[PDB]
Amino acid sequence: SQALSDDIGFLLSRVGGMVLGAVNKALVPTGLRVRSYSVLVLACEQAEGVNQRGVAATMGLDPSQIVGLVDELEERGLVVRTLRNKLIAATEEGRRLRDDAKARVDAAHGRYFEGIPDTVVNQMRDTLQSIAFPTFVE
Amino acid sequence: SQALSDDIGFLLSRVGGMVLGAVNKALVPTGLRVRSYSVLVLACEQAEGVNQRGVAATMGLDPSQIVGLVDELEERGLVVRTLDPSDRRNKLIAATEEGRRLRDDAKARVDAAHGRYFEGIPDTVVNQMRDTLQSIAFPTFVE
Ligand SMILES: CC(C)(COP(=O)(O)OP(=O)(O)OC[C@H]1O[C@@H](n2cnc3c(N)ncnc32)[C@H](O)[C@@H]1OP(=O)(O)O)[C@@H](O)C(=O)NCCC(=O)NCCSC(=O)/C=C/c1ccc(O)cc1
Ligand SMILES: CC(C)(COP(=O)(O)OP(=O)(O)OC[C@H]1O[C@@H](n2cnc3c(N)ncnc32)[C@H](O)[C@@H]1OP(=O)(O)O)[C@@H](O)C(=O)NCCC(=O)NCCSC(=O)/C=C/c1ccc(O)cc1
Ligand SMILES: [Cl-]
Ligand SMILES: [Cl-]
Ligand SMILES: [Cl-]
Ligand SMILES: [Mg+2]
Ligand SMILES: [Mg+2]
């Protein structure tokens, strides 16, 4: 089928945007939106700060875009930017808000994947990781 | 897993965004962007045209958001607002000959641009992803 509604690229972009909208809606009480949430999660994965370069690469953004997200998070004392190399270190308050936000984010997920078994989610996860994070550039 | 890179919602938005940016870039020679392209494609799929509400539902948008996309395509002579010959109360967005020719050019670009991401995936994996994403975007009901 050559129909748009059967096209996997269309579908991925459509469901990605549905998830993005739902997660932004769920995040409203936290003051975060998806990109600032993502920087905060990445910072909270480590004790010491995480490499800003690496954050940008993971998120598929230029480092210049991550700068403003770090400023946003620092406005609320959620991360502290430390040192040509730049690292982003989560605070105790950052870690607390990350937990509250993630429960809202999971639920926003739960709503879209209800009735879809974990075996299907696991295969989707692997496939999407192989696209976003390939072993080399073809 | 607590890791962002294991969050299926993150990965959907991450790869969805890769696809969106690649499609806008592939479309630069056509003058279209992802939404105007989608409307043009959906009009071309029908012989007589497609209803605004159908387009909106396929794109997950309110119908009010489709009017300006149709205006853009109409100003370029790529679609025409017409009336369904089988029901004149049914307004249709119909592709023109020039719209069909551009849609063929544009879909060739977008197909090739998608290949970078999807060509290497096993067919059985793609098929399962397709059907799963359809069940999320376009839920079905009782028979
Ligand atoms: C349409 C999207 C996906 C969602 O936009 P949104 O609905 O404005 O959502 P937001 O993330 O801005 O806000 C989320 C929700 O939280 C709400 N919200 C927010 N901030 C607050 C607040 N501070 N207080 C209270 N409430 C709040 C906000 O109003 C909204 O609520 P609701 O309307 O009920 O869903 C938007 O991200 C977007 O346009 N993305 C770019 C891509 C795009 O054009 N998508 C449209 C579908 S067409 C498509 O995907 C085609 C792709 C395609 C791909 C490949 C191809 O080959 C061909 C085509
Ligand atoms: C071409 C895009 C998709 C849109 O840019 P644009 O057309 O030049 O225009 P705008 O900058 O006005 O953006 C249009 C809308 O695209 C929306 N958008 C912005 N990223 C996207 C996108 N990945 N898909 C789908 N619409 C988008 C964005 O929110 C905005 O919505 P709205 O404000 O309602 O009009 C551009 O954002 C782009 O190239 N994105 C690729 C880079 C990217 O998104 N990387 C991932 C960042 S991290 C992230 O998204 C995390 C999400 C997340 C989700 C769930 C979780 O559980 C956890 C995390
Ligand atoms: Cl954005
Ligand atoms: Cl940004
Ligand atoms: Cl219209
Ligand atoms: Mg919006
Ligand atoms: Mg600010």
Numbering used by the authors:
A (entry chain A): 4 to 86, 92 to 146
B (entry chain B): 4 to 146
Which lines from the publication concern this structure?
The CouR regulon was defined by mapping CouR-binding sites to the cou promoters and demonstrating that CouR acts as a repressor. Consistent with the EMSA data, CouR did not detectably bind either p-coumarate or CoASH.
To determine the molecular basis for recognition of p-coumaroyl–CoA by CouR and its potential effects on the conformation of this repressor, we determined a crystal structure of the CouR–p-coumaroyl–CoA complex to 1.52 Å resolution. The AU of the CouR–p-coumaroyl–CoA structure contained a single CouR dimer (Chains A and B) and two molecules of p-coumaroyl–CoA. The p-coumaroyl–CoA ligands bound in the central cavity formed between the two chains of the CouR dimer. The phenolic moiety of each of the ligands occupied equivalent hydrophobic pockets deep within each CouR protomer. Indeed, the phenolic hydroxyl formed hydrogen bonds with Asp10A and His117B of the different protomers. In contrast to the buried phenolic moieties, the CoA moieties of the ligands were solvent-exposed on the surface of the groove formed between the two wHTH motifs. Strikingly, the two CoA moieties adopted different configurations: one of the ligand molecules was bound in an ‘extended’ configuration along the α1 helix while the other adopted a ‘bent’ conformation with its adenyl group curved back and inserted between the pantothenyl regions of the two ligands. Despite these differences, the six phosphates of the two ligand molecules were nearly collinear, occupying the length of the groove formed between the two protomers of CouR, and were fully solvent exposed. Superposition of individual protomers of the CouR dimer (i.e., Chain A or Chain B) with a single protomer of ligand-bound CouR (Chain A) yielded RMSD values of 0.81 and 0.82 Å over 112 and 118 matching α-carbon atoms, respectively, indicating that at the level of a single chain, CouR does not undergo significant conformational change upon binding of p-coumaroyl–CoA. More significantly, the structural data combined with the functional characterization of the CouR variants strongly indicate that the anionic, bulky CoA moiety of p-hydroxycinnamoyl–CoA prevents the binding of DNA by steric occlusion and charge repulsion.
